[PDB]
Amino acid sequence: MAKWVCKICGYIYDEDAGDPDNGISPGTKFEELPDDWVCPICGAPKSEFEKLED
Ligand SMILES: [Fe+3]
């Protein structure tokens, strides 16, 4: 699946890994993350992520 980078801190949200410590099971697409999920490292909102492709 896809990877998305936090443009603020460099954390990579990997859809294959999810974010289980914050309620997100592996295989959860970025678009399916709750509206109030934030970067687990820096707290940035979803708006600050970019998909790693193209
Ligand atoms: Fe971040």
Measured in angstroms, the resolution is 1.1
Indicate the SS3 state at residue 32: helix
What backbone torsions phi and psi does residue 32 show, to the nearest 5 degrees? -90, -5
Long-range contacts formed by 7-10: CB under 8 A, 24+ apart: 7/44, 7/48, 7/49, 7/50, 8/39, 8/42, 8/44, 8/48, 9/39, 9/41, 9/42, 9/44
Neighbours of 51 (CB within 10 A): 12
* 6 marked as binding residue: yes
Contact 45, 38 (CB under 8 A): yes
Is 39 annotated to bind ligand? yes
52 is in an annotated binding site: no
CA–CA distance, 50 with 4 (Å, rounded to integer): 5
- What residues contact 42, with CB distance under 8 A and at least 6 apart? 6, 8, 9, 11
Using what technique was this structure determined? X-ray
Measured between alpha carbons, how far is 54 from 45 in angstroms, rounded to an integer? 22
Distance between CA atoms of residues 50 and 9, nearest Å: 12
Q: State in Å: Cα 30 to ligand 1 middle.
A: 14
Q: Give the other-Cβ count within 10 Å of 6's Cβ.
A: 21
Domains contained in the chain, CATH given: 1-54 (2.20.28.10)
